[PDB]
């Protein structure tokens, strides 16, 4: 999403979208510029190695 | 009229105009032997700052 958001800010210029006012991403359910509790607290179990 | 060419087994044959006729082929291990204009020749032509064409021809 950052690979495509940077190409639009380069191309659109003064027409750059306001992505902060957009709806959530239904894949993960996150807002723009926000992590998920599982990824912000790093609570995912890791292997012993 | 033929233009300068490099023959692999003979050498560098110079330009010849059969209208005024001379296939001179110069071979060697140095650029001077080949008969072409080398870098040193361009330095001798660049230092000749006195050469000037006659006023009548200018």
């Amino acid at each position: 999403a950052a690979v495509e958001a940077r190409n639009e800010d380069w191309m659109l210029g003064p027409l750059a979208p306001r992505r902060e006012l957009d709806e959530i991403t239904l894949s993960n359910g996150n807002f723009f510029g926000s992590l998920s509790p599982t990824r912000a607290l790093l609570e995912s179990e890791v292997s012993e190695e | 009229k033929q233009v300068r060419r490099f023959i692999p087994g003979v050498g560098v044959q110079d330009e010849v105009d059969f209208s005024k006729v001379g296939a001179v082929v110069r071979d060697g291990k140095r650029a001077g032997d080949l008969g072409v204009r080398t870098r040193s020749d361009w330095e001798v032509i660049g230092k000749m700052k006195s050469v000037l064409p006659k006023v009548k021809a200018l």
Partner: protein, 182 residues
């Protein structure tokens, strides 16, 4: 210079051969014209296309800024008695654009998604057949009327650039022969 919004709808419980006809109906129409056709259609998926077209319009107005120039355009037409722009779409329909910021449905295509489910068809002779329940989506590309006023000026310039029709054209002779035939 030209704003654009690509919106992909949610997974609709229908097929591509059914919804394809609902995307060809709203193609080229303005969002207001396209919503009036979904409100009065008899198709069950026209109610879903009316909800997804209201979401895309909200994204265009908020995220992309489209459709936000009305008040300013209404002045020139009335306050100054200006002559609006008259264009002709690629299909040939003549339009009269008074507000160049009006949103419309530039492009639209339907794709097929995952398999909703699987039904079993129990025929005679103990035969069973699998019936795949389809889900499908639609994409709408929303643009402002400035895109149609630019595309019309290009088609008009390409028509005035091909030159006029001459009575006796200088057609080429495409056979070369090493002699004269006349």
């Amino acid at each position: 210079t030209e704003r654009k919004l690509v919106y992909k709808t949610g997974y609709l419980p229908t097929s591509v051969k059914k919804l394809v006809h609902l995307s060809r109906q709203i193609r080229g129409k303005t969002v207001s014209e396209a919503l009036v056709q979904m409100q009065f259609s008899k198709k069950k998926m026209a109610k879903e296309v009316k909800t997804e077209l209201l979401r895309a319009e909200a994204k265009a107005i908020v995220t992309r800024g489209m459709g936000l120039g009305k008040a300013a355009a209404a002045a020139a037409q009335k306050e100054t008695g200006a002559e609006p722009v008259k264009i002709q779409t690629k299909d040939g329909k003549h339009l009269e654009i008074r507000d160049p910021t009006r949103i419309y449905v530039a492009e639209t295509f339907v794709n097929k998604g995952f398999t909703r489910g699987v039904e079993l068809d129990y025929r005679a002779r103990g035969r069973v057949f699998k019936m795949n329940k389809p889900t499908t989506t639609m994409t709408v590309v929303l643009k402002e009327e400035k895109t149609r006023i630019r595309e019309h000026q290009e088609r008009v310039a390409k028509k005035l650039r091909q030159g006029p029709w001459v009575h006796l054209p200088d057609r080429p002779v495409t056979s070369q022969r090493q002699f004269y035939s006349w």
